[model samples]
Target chain A: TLHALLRDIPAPDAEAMARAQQHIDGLLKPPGSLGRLETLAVQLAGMPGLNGTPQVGEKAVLVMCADHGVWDEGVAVSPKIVTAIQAANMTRGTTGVCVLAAQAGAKVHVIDVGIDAEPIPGVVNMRVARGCGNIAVGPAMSRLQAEALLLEVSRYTCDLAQRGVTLFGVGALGMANTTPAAAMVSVFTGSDAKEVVGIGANLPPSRIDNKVDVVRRAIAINQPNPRDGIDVLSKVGGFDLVGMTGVMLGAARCGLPVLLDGFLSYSAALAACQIAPAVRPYLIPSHFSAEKGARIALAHLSMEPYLHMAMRLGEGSGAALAMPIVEAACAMFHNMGELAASNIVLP
Target chain B: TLHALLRDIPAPDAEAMARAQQHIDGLLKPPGSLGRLETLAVQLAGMPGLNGTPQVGEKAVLVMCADHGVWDEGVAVSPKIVTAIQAANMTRGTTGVCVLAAQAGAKVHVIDVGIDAEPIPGVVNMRVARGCGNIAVGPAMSRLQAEALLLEVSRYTCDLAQRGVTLFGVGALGMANTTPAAAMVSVFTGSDAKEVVGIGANLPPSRIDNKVDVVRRAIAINQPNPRDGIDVLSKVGGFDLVGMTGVMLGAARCGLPVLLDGFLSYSAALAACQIAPAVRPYLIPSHFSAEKGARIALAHLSMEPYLHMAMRLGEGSGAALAMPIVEAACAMFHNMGELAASNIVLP
Candidate 1:
């Protein structure tokens, strides 16, 4: 069912981009003088029916929360239970990411993709098997289970798009998920796991070193085929990663822009692009994260990040901060008058 | 009259800063993990009555527009008319910076310090002169005029602070203004004029070379005394720059934070610090501009800019974007739950 829906994803509007270029150039400033915001504005105008004018419209941050069976291997600094607690706190709007998301006028949608905790009152309960198996020991989830999680996430996101959300920022709430994330990168990038693993949740030196070993061993044991994205994901990816990939795919299918946060979300974006190359146009890197492999992912994907704040806290905070910048770009296209109207000649 | 209000200036609350640091340390995130945002929050919390919590309550970008007499020397890429046109565009909320400023819930206030145009509606006509004289030939303004303009700016900003506006973003609109700016840096930092001069307003290589020589010549002609900031302002500064320095001083005296933008504003900031070293704490460098001397000014001021977007837009656009990031930082302290409350132990 999802495969049929994936096929229906339309390509980006190239003609609208060309038309918007003329509109942007006519505004009172130097050509490309607004910098990255100008690029963002032109892209916004290219989206579906946006044409030469764009507005940010309504925004939402999709925070997919889960737990890794790899957590039992002490791959994370914080305990596994922190994921569930933070997830619950996210629903209560008292989480770190929640407060930061308010920087832009974005609402947080907390989804329990696979958290191994009791049901929280406000969180959307879409648990996909109480968290999957450890990637170091065995497959994180079955291919069928991965497909099921993807279908659930995509369906939910498309539903949100139908409700008139213009932008979707992808974020995560999970412990030790960075291990699976790094493993996924190792599968795709063919880089050594040691070089890619960073201090997730600020893990200690020995734990970070052990995480490198875990990722190396996990990839060796799984032997995930880099040819297929879902194959790699089913073997070493967490539910949150799969769900985020689905969100990106779903947002693309709906012709909506998806703002991607740090390393974990980039892993999902990289996978989603491999799964369906058409989804690349819909994805936006919100920040240049401080994680080790984030720059690698950005380079591999041909994406540029504007905000380089060395921010590590995910949960869509970095992405949310960038949303307003994008909005301002779109607003410039819509609200500003032509240079001809001002009779000001551009240099 | 404004000099009396300067005596009322109060110091930031050191106790509140200490208390806020502990509060940030108690949050779920790692200590000092949020980087500059944590520092920004701590500083915001230190604002006398802010206690251990800070909110970027009311936001405004005080845009000072003027005409630079250095235009007569053919120092800029664009003509003098561009300044007046851009200033009017700013007042109409159709300028490049206006749309971006909207992203941070901030409004733009256009003040005419000395534009070479007839009065435009919506723009406050606070002209100190039609435009000053060419610094290559004579001082831009007499010492008495520079002090008078400074007094005017300080009085206006103190009124804004009195009305409960907490954040002040310093910006300007003028052509060839960067000449005086570079000259100001040359005086304060004891650096060569060429080392700090950049391609302002997209000047060609020939003009850039000409600009360097002009700056060196202007300083030689003006012979501005380093000990007296008024002498520097009157000799080499534009009225817009003089006003921004006053705004920084006035904001500092009133215990408010001032967000500093690119080259011209940085020049104002450097001069403001030279005027009163106590004003140093109130100035915030929003981004490291792509302009050559930006790093020189930032390093000399001992300020760190988190965003490295390579933006050179000078109308408070960069500062406006960083405001949201600062807000998110404040929200992190005010809203995020303590780690102990969430029962999550940090390693």
Candidate 2:
């Protein structure tokens, strides 16, 4: 359902790249002095059709929140109540990502893909299921449910794209999502579970080791093929993963830049990239989070993230912080007149 | 006037120190896990008359902005426009310190103690002089002007204390303030001029070497006393330094926690401590800046900073970022209640 919406969207335009490159060269600093900004500007320039100077017209961040059934197995130190508490904090604009998004001039859309409890009203509540099944015992979600969740996310992308949004950020909110994310990373990369897992919320060492074992067991049991992205996602992915994958596809299909946040979103991007390899050109890794799984996910993609502030807090905070750099790059492209246009010598 | 205010303020309270020590023991994390925060909580407890808990109430950052006449010698890569541009950005809420203050739930007051331009409305504008005389050419500020600037800052501190503000952060906004700071450091620490100076932005090699020469010459000409802090500051200090010294005295007088921002603030605090030895207990080093002069200043004061993020930005951004960690320390005191109160056993 998600792939269908993205199928008809156009590919990145060549004219935007030409224009963006021209603007970057005209900026006062030496070429590539801004480091990651140079790449972000080049990528953003190609997303839209503008050839000479593409302005960052609009940006939105989609947070696909859910609950992981793995929490029932004592995988995380903080109780599941933290998920609801943090999500509620997000609505109140007190959470780090919510505040950062506001500062970055990005509209945040919170989606309730699947939570064990009902979400508060007046919040972006689009439930795909009550919650995923216990992944420690079995697969997290069914193939059909995963596809439906992706389709739902794709629909959101189409809706936002129609409203003239050009930049998209994908993030996830949930407790114990790292368990599934690490599990997916271990399966895809064929890495040791111990190396991929982190001390989530300073969990008890014995319990963390147990969680790692569960992930290793699940990956062994599923033996999911990496070639079929959706097949792999459906067998092991949570609703949030399915939703974020849909968001990536939706943005790629619409020829918009997609900024992926941390490990969960990176996992979804990995699945989405396998489904649509062309989407690689549109994706920007925002940061390498302190989370161990996030680093593994970035390494698996062979993509360099823009910043490293030692941030582990999820909910798109890193992406939101990075948006300013993106905006500065885009502004440099648009405001800095070309050498020929300004009658200056070309370097 | 500032010295008079400093003399009238009560000494650090013993009851508060005992309270802070007890509170530090109650934090959830391992003892001294948060290195500086543990020490900060203990320091706050002693200064604020709290027996076992210290509350950081009504936080405010005072940024003393001035322009160095020494820029006339072409020492810095960035032109004098950066001083005004940064100050203007501070007023417009675009600079790093502004963003951090917003994040840390603290208010920032930008004070133009001495700058070339007229102050922007809504900014705390207090002209000590048109601008400090070129330090390489003459004293940066005359003895009378430095005393006036210090008095002005002391008055502001007293006023803030009356409004119930208990913690103070001192920051300086200037282009070549580091030149004067480095010169003062060379005089006080009896260090090689080149060893104490650092690259202010990316200056041309010749210009950087010239800056080192300027500092050496200023130190030789001034022959500043290490013991007479007031004489040293009046002879070689920029307007911002005098203003910050006054701020430290004000904080000390009010019995508030005065967090020093960087090398410049450290220099100012050292001078203030010389004037009023009792003020040492109220002073807190925010961080050790990447600049080498900060090390000399830290050693001179016999103090270590609270955090070390390798920050070089001089607009109190580092101090503002450190505020959250400081708040966490205070929150541990306030929210942890008691181990017995929560029926929790100490591990």
Candidate 3:
């Protein structure tokens, strides 16, 4: 039933997209002069919101937290348990994303799909699995587990959107989440590990090499077929990865616009697009991640990020800050008076 | 008296700058990854504020409004009266900069230094001149008037800083102000008129060419000697232009950080630097203007803007939006936990 959902969701309304572009073109400034900001507004205008009109309202950054077995393979420098600690801290309003989200006027909805920790107080209790099997040694999760988790993710995301959260920004929150993100991006783009890998969370060259090796080996061992989204997701994907995939689909299914956090989420976005070709219209690149694979993935989608902060902190850091730019764009689009009305005409 | 003030001003504190840099180096993200933002924060740290420390407080966009005689030279797209009308709109919170500054937690201060229309209710009544003389015909103002306005700008700015407004982002207001700004930049940089002029307020290609010719003719006719800053200012400067020169000096003298608006204001930044070399340390480029002069000016000052939005509107538009980025940089610098502190050790 869930497999059918991704295939059934229709593409965004072309008429709305055209209307959005036309509206921005008339806004008292030069066409496309806002750079990606104008483009972003036009994209938002294309997506249907709660009122069946294009708008951003009551947004949330869905942080999918999990733990990767690859950390034990020495690919990640830090202890894996730091994921749970940061997850708990994130809910307490003390983490980086927490502060930024508060300033950005968005709530953080964290789902602990996988982690080897005691049940946290504030994080949503969605335990798909505990620390998805170390990918370098074996598969991250079974094909069945990945599909089930994805279905649940779809439910969570689409449910939230239906409840009036029109804007959905996706974020990654596991230790070494970018590893699988890179692996998947490398799979889709057929890029070398170097091309898609970056110093995620400040990985030294030594550990960076280990990360590359893990991504390559895990993908090889799992033998994920691109033809089957679930197979590709389960073998090479952590729970957080597939969860973000579900989030992407959920937003697209509801005709809502989505802002991607960074590289890892960009990987998830690629996976989502592969499953549903129509989802591309709903996607927005919030920022150009300093991480490696993001740009390659964006090229695949034919999109440019609105912000280039060189920020690689993935917990919706870029997306949260980017919400204001979207607001600014929408504000200028709607509030600015027409040239004739203002008695001003462009030369 | 104003000329007397330009020869001397205190330099920004080196120790606080080093402290800010070191503090960010130890933050969770990579070193120098924020690019100009880190540099901007460091500059802010060096300036003297309410407590003689480097910190932005009570931020405001000081909009200096005037009417440019170059409008008669056919350099501008809009009517000359648009300056006064927009100034009124800004004060009434009905314009681009006003809306952006409100969203960014910044106050808008519109100073009617030079305009043709009767004074609006909300605009600050600081009339330096009714309108500047046509630069294409001859000098824009007397050297004495330029000096006096600079002194007034300095006095107004320093008084605000003393009253606890530490962050002052400068913006320009006038129909054809960019013409004189272009003329002054050409005088200082020896750049071609083509390289330093741009489509200010959406000038068509013919008007754009006319603007270039006006700047060149104004410079050739006046021969504003670069050796004397006052001579240059008097020749190709408007009341709004030189008044911004005063603001820069005033902010620097009070040890406050200032964000230059765009192309027209970049011209004033050049004037400020020419007057007192020490002011460079207290300066922050909020965004790169779509205009050509900004890059040339930035190259001359060895400075770089943080935002590249391709924005050409000059009523503190970029500066107002950029204030939140200043907040973001500070948030990450101070709020983020260190590797050792968070118990997440780097490899």
Candidate 4:
């Protein structure tokens, strides 16, 4: 399955993009007046079989839920049990991402990857374990477990694409998840733990030092291989992070665009890109997270977020909020008038 | 009427905003996790009679159309006649703003304040004149003409508010109008014409020096009073600029929120703030224009644009694209579950 997924990933269609760009320039507005939307349309046209005209298509947000053992280190302001609670809340369609996705005409799917509690009635059961080991003390999981989780999620995502979800948003729910995110970002980007770690969930100034210390300890003990994404995930990443990385890989293989939420999604994408460099173009950043390390992670990806709401909600909320923007870009490309068809003429 | 408009303008309801803030903080997410959206919801709650439950009311983008005599100076790449052509295109719902507004579930109203041609069949005919004089040679219009245009548009906007248009987006169309916008921004913000003037409509580098010179000559020739918005408008602002300023003033008086487009809207809004400082809170900037002078103009207003698409299309396209975000903010505020009602608990 991995070999097939890797072999099937295709480059963006350059000919279709060129044709789309030419059509956009001929629109009634000034050349490049629609700004990033014009570029976004051209990019979407390059999607598999889109030719020069792109459709907004059906949208879904896949929120991978789990629990982080690093919560024992007192790294976050929220209790560990909140992860299970929010996962159940998401199933009720009453969480941050759910409400925002409802407004964007997109559906939310809560997949329980490693929640510590019993299975929630509405969530998809894909649990690897109740939870993994504490990252600050030991490896989060074995390398085989990490690869298996990634394979499972990728297969699930590819099935979703086959079911006609052309656009996907990646989100995650896990307490103390930022610890693993920052840790993975540090290892992948070759940045020190001190530079990548942040006060997760609004931890006080006093707690930030402890959070940084925990990240540094985890890196020192595990020594995650910078060249191996699976090594990094097994060492410090959570089930939700690995699952999101799988979704990105799967979406890219199927030639679909995926919206990325805040820090967790960024960290996951960075690892995904390491595993498969072809995943970068399929990823679209939705918002600049208020978390301090978000900019550093985004800068490494060389991707600019569409919205700067400073939102830090992790459950695909930012991606959901940005769905309409993606739709508008596609809509404008199809509906705007051509200059030659109108009475307007350039000087 | 102006006196009555000024007298009736009310301050935002602080008590309601406080109540809204408290409720938002109690929602099932980390504090400030929703970031700007939470602030937006609180601000919306401050609307008169909204109490703490704000509604995303009917939305419209008012595309004020006109022609600028500044086109005679050859400062733009498009012909002056493109103004009338695009105005007609707007009525046909085929322009940039129209297509994007359609996706945003908002209506577009093209108001012809000064088209320099016979009124189109479908446009709102509120023509102030055929057009005004070239600012490079003399005043754009008489002080009385500026005041009359402002009064007419303000009255029209107030009527729309009464007819259930609670949210407004301000956009303008006029060939070579950026010359006047540069002039107004320079005068109002006390920035030099050399700094404020930009190559509008993708003018060649060779044309930039002339565009700056045109702006410098206009300011020197017209001597617009920096202290008085009407004086500035009569001297160098175009009919469409004055009309947008009127819409802002009227929207503020009715306690309605107005979204501003790009450079042209920014310049017009600076003048509106000058005319009525109370209008400041009512105004919401939509996007940062790609024009070189946009940041300087936005800085003068102490406003941050919501989207950074680098869009320069000034027909309220940016504002229309942001409509769903506004709606999502309201939806999240109304639908997100409270923490107390859920099983989640903070550390």
Number of the top lDDT candidate: 4
Model 1 steric clash pairs: none
Which one wins on DockQ? 4
TM-score of 2: 0.65
Better of 1 and 3 by lDDT: 1
Per-chain TM-score, chain A, candidate 1:
0.97
C-alpha displacement of B258 in model 4, angstroms? 0.6
Per-residue lDDT value at A26 in model 4: 90
Ten residues in a row with the worst lDDT in model 3 chain A? A47-56
Q: What is the C-alpha interface RMSD of model 3?
A: 3.3
CA lDDT, every prediction?
0.82, 0.71, 0.77, 0.87
On a 0 to 1 DockQ scale, where is model 4?
A: 0.83
Across all candidates, the chain A TM-score values are 0.97, 0.92, 0.94, 0.97
lDDT of 1 by residue, A1-347 (tens): 77886898888788788888888888877665566677787777666734335666678899999988998888887778888888878877787667777767788999998898887788988888787789998999999988888888888887886566888899988888889999998888888887789887788776787889899889989999988999999999999999899899888877788899889998898899999988898887888877888877788789988777777778777788778777777777887778888776746
TM-score of chain A of 2: 0.92
Q: Candidate 4: which docking quality band?
A: high
- Native contact recovery (fnat) for each candidate is 0.60, 0.00, 0.24, 0.90
Candidate 2 residue-wise lDDT, A4-120, digit = tens: 665665677777677667666564332443334456677777775333344566778888788888788777765665566556656666555665576567888888888778776
lDDT of 3 by residue, B103-125 (tens): 77788888888898888887887
Highest TM-score: which candidate? Answer: 4
Q: Model 3: residues >4 Å from true position, as ranges?
A: A7-10, A13-37, A50-56, A206-210, A219-231, A337-341, A345-347, B3-9, B21-40, B50-56, B227-230, B337-342
Please give the range of 10 consecutive residues that has the lowest summed lDDT in model 1 chain B.
B46-55
Candidates sorted by TM-score, best first: 4, 1, 3, 2
1 or 3: which has the higher TM-score?
1
